[PDB]
Every structure is written in C-alpha cells, then in structure tokens.
Enzyme design. Structure first.
Site, mmCIF file in Angstrom:
data_model
loop_
_atom_site.group_PDB
_atom_site.id
_atom_site.type_symbol
_atom_site.label_atom_id
_atom_site.label_comp_id
_atom_site.label_asym_id
_atom_site.label_seq_id
_atom_site.Cartn_x
_atom_site.Cartn_y
_atom_site.Cartn_z
ATOM 1 N N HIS A 1 -6.291 13.999 52.312
ATOM 2 C CA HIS A 1 -4.853 13.640 52.009
ATOM 3 C C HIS A 1 -3.795 14.553 52.678
ATOM 4 C CE1 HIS A 1 -5.405 15.280 47.905
ATOM 5 N NE2 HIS A 1 -4.251 15.610 48.059
ATOM 6 N N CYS B 1 -4.381 20.789 44.721
ATOM 7 C CA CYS B 1 -5.143 20.038 45.834
ATOM 8 C C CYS B 1 -5.549 21.112 46.806
ATOM 9 C CB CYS B 1 -4.618 19.005 46.423
ATOM 10 S SG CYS B 1 -4.371 17.401 45.299
ATOM 11 N N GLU C 1 -13.205 12.651 51.580
ATOM 12 C CA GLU C 1 -12.084 13.337 51.188
ATOM 13 C C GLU C 1 -11.952 14.772 51.589
ATOM 14 O OE1 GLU C 1 -9.346 11.977 50.655
ATOM 15 O OE2 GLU C 1 -8.150 13.501 49.959
ATOM 16 N N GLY D 1 -0.010 20.170 42.911
ATOM 17 C CA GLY D 1 -0.052 21.447 43.597
ATOM 18 C C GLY D 1 -1.313 22.345 43.534
#
Lengths: 188, 188
Positions: free
Chosen positions: B40, B147, B71, B145
């Site tokens: 992402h 990730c 991902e 925050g």
C-alpha cells in the site's frame, strides 16, 4: 541492553490509565491505593481509572523546600484492589542511569516500550512556563500522549515522563522517601 | 516472555524509515540491498530512505498463484551499505506463534516495541477493499503509523504490519523462499 522484562512487570501489575479534565496519562500505582501522576493532569476530587470513575481521597502536588514545583502528584484512590508494593524498587537518591526504558499505558497505546538510553540528572527545567526541579533528561524525541510514562532500569523505577521538546524527554524523579508512612501534619 | 532483545537487534541493524507519496513506513532490509515494504506504500522509481532520496532499482508487489495480493513489495535499492543478511531468521512455512513483538521505526516513533501476544495464521483478509492472502493476526488494537512494523519472536522475523481495525492487527507473512536467488524470467 534495556531491562524490558522489568519494565513489563511494572506495567502489568502497577499501571492504570488515568483520565482528568486534562486528558489521559499513564498512572503508576505505588503501594496500597497510592499512585502518582504528573501535576499537569490537574487532579480534582474524582478521576477515571481504566474508565471507571473513582473518588480521589487525597492529592498532594509535590513541591520542594524552595517552594518550586516537582511535577509529581501523589493520589490516594477509593478502589478495591491494592497495588503490589513497589517502594523497594524506588531509588534512595538522585542519580544518573544507563539504558532506561520509557513505558506507556493509555487507551491509545495500551502497552508500549521505548528505550531512551542514558538518563541524566538535569535539575532545573522550565516546564511550559512553570519552573520545576529534580528533572531527569533523556536524549530521545518526545511525542504527545506519553505523560506519566514510567521510566525504568532493571530493578529501579526512577521517574515518570512529564514533557519534552522535539529532541529531549523529561521525567520527574521518584524517590523512596516520597512514600514512607510518617508525621501528623495539616496538609490542605 | 517476549524476545525484546531479538526485536531490538533486528530494528537496529535492519530497519530504515521509508517514505513514498503515501507516507512513512517502517522498512525491513533483508539482505544485500533488498528490503520489504507494504504494497500500500505504492513504491515508484525513487523513495526516501532515512530522508535520503534513493533510486528504486526493482520493486515486486507479491501476489500468489490465485493472483491475489499478498501485500508485500520487495524492493532493491541503489545505496552503498548492504543490510546484514537476516534470511536465516525467516520462517520456512506458515505457522502460529507465541508472544510476538511488533517494532516500529518512523520519524514519529524512531524505536518502539509492542508485545501483541499470540499470532494466528488468519488467511484471507479484505484489506481496505483489496482481497489479500497469507495474513497473520494478533489481538491488539492498531493505531496509524505502524505500517511495515516488523513482527518478531525470538529468532524469527515473521512478517510486517499492514493494517487493523480497532481491536486486531494484521501482518503480511514473510517466508524464507521469497528471497532465495533463482530463475531467468521477464517480470515487468
């Protein structure tokens, strides 16, 4: 390196989330139903502890003999459980320390650990315009929401977080003698 | 309890702060100049690494044989230092784990450690509207925050944080075989 296991044991048995008109703070329970929180929390006569509304039986905003703010408030709470007694882990004297952890327990961060490296006895600090004594300093950035974070080294609980600029953090010292059973004195 | 010492060693030698048009992410360097970041993040052809602008020589957004998002994006960077090779700490297979740490390294939180308890092989997850496979789940709130936060147990790097709802967190699995030197194949 850091005593993560020690900081973790303090957080589990001895901290709660406290909430006042000023917001949320990590709150360190010390013995019986006595705890500490930064003076800037502005403790009144009731407080939320883990979101339960709790009567504050006593609050003492500590100042030293120069009548200067120390930024610790000792509170006695009306609640059923006692805190595990952690007075023996409190330092006898002012000191500098190696390799500290700052641990935070809020609704936002329910368990978070931050090594902050060396902790120096810094002394005077102007803390948002209130002169203040007995400050510990660590060279780590500070972010909002850490107030009351508990600062430890293995086997020692050395203070609680009270502020910072973008580069350093400040904790208010905890000393063993703040919490010894004592004398008959009108305090309010 | 948690392997805090292990998570700390991974964070010091093997993470960097990465910044893309999408924001900042904890980025885990794996070997040589190969690292991972959540898909992402939307990696392009240049990226900031510790605030230094860096050429992205290669980016592979991993998908499985059902053509479903995993991902993870594997990036190769144009920079001078190699990462310490941590492939041997990667799990061979899908698995469940006890007592994990989630560690974060951003400009906001430059070093923060969060025990997240048990980690379960969760499988399918709808991740902000993108179906995704091979997800690990931990029963800990998630905050913004985090990730790319690296999820470890002692001696194992098991994945990287990719999302959450107010109650659980999700990490994308890391497997050893994602990073073995290999075959001659047109990938773009």
């Amino acid at each position: 390196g850091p005593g993560f296991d020690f900081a973790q044991a303090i957080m589990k048995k001895n901290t709660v989330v406290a909430r006042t008109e000023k917001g949320e703070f990590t709150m360190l329970g010390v013995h019986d139903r006595v705890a500490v929180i930064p003076t800037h929390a502005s403790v009144g006569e009731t407080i939320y502890i883990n979101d339960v509304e709790t009567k504050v039986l006593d609050a003492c905003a500590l100042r030293d003999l120069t009548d200067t703010n120390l930024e610790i408030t000792i509170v006695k709470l009306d609640r059923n459980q006692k805190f595990r007694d952690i007075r023996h882990f409190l330092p006898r004297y002012e000191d500098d320390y190696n390799d500290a952890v700052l641990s935070v327990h809020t609704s936002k961060f329910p368990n978070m650990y931050i090594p902050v490296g060396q902790v120096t006895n810094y002394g005077f600090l102007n803390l948002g315009g209130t002169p203040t004594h007995r400050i510990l300093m660590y060279n780590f950035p500070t972010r909002a929401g850490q107030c009351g974070g508990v600062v430890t080294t293995t086997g020692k609980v050395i203070g609680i977080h009270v502020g910072g600029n973008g580069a350093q953090g400040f904790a208010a010292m905890l000393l063993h003698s703040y919490f010894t059973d004592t004398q008959k004195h009108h305090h309010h």
